[PDB]
């Protein structure tokens, strides 16, 4: 329900990243999404700003996590919790989505992790927002507020 609402946004964000890198994942073959895309456009724009200002971090993120099938989900939960442990703001929501996107596109497609982890991570990201972030987000006006805040 609400988890689905977030997955729609996360799916499109990850799908564009997948296609830039050149991958062709099942379920992310294309963007038929068409006013909701305005959320996608803002997320890609400000998401790309944050990683282009900290390139070396995201370039080497997977090498430090050394994710395996045993540690992928616990590592995701632990890092996400630590992003918001001392508070929430729209900027941190973005940081969390850029972490997730890079987590699904790069670390999830390493040799020891198959394509099946792309959709799993997207689900982890979506469930996390619906369970842990939905209250604050609707406090700040939902996605409409997200849009106004980043222009």
């Amino acid at each position: 329900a609400q988890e689905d609402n977030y997955k729609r946004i996360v799916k499109s964000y990850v799908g564009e990243k997948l296609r830039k890198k050149g991958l062709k994942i099942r379920g992310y073959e294309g963007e038929e999404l068409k006013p909701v895309i305005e959320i996608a456009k803002t997320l890609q724009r400000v998401g790309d700003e944050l990683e282009s200002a900290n390139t070396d971090f995201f370039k080497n993120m997977c090498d430090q996590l050394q994710i395996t099938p045993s540690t992928a989900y616990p590592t995701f939960q632990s890092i996400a919790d630590e992003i918001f442990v001392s508070g929430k703001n729209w900027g941190r929501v973005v940081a969390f989505l850029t972490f997730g996107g890079n987590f699904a596109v790069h670390c999830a497609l390493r040799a020891d992790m198959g394509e099946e982890y792309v959709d799993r991570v997207v689900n982890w990201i979506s469930k996390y927002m619906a369970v842990n972030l939905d209250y604050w987000i609707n406090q700040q006006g939902g996605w409409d507020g997200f849009l106004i805040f980043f222009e």
Binding site: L50, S78, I79, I83, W90, R92, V94
Partner: peptide, 22 residues
């Protein structure tokens, strides 16, 4: 993992500080 999430939250703060119109 611990400090990775803390570094990401600082990255998010830098972005929030920029767009802050307040």
């Amino acid at each position: 993992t611990e400090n990775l999430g803390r570094v990401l939250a600082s990255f998010g703060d830098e972005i929030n500080d920029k767009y802050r119109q307040v």
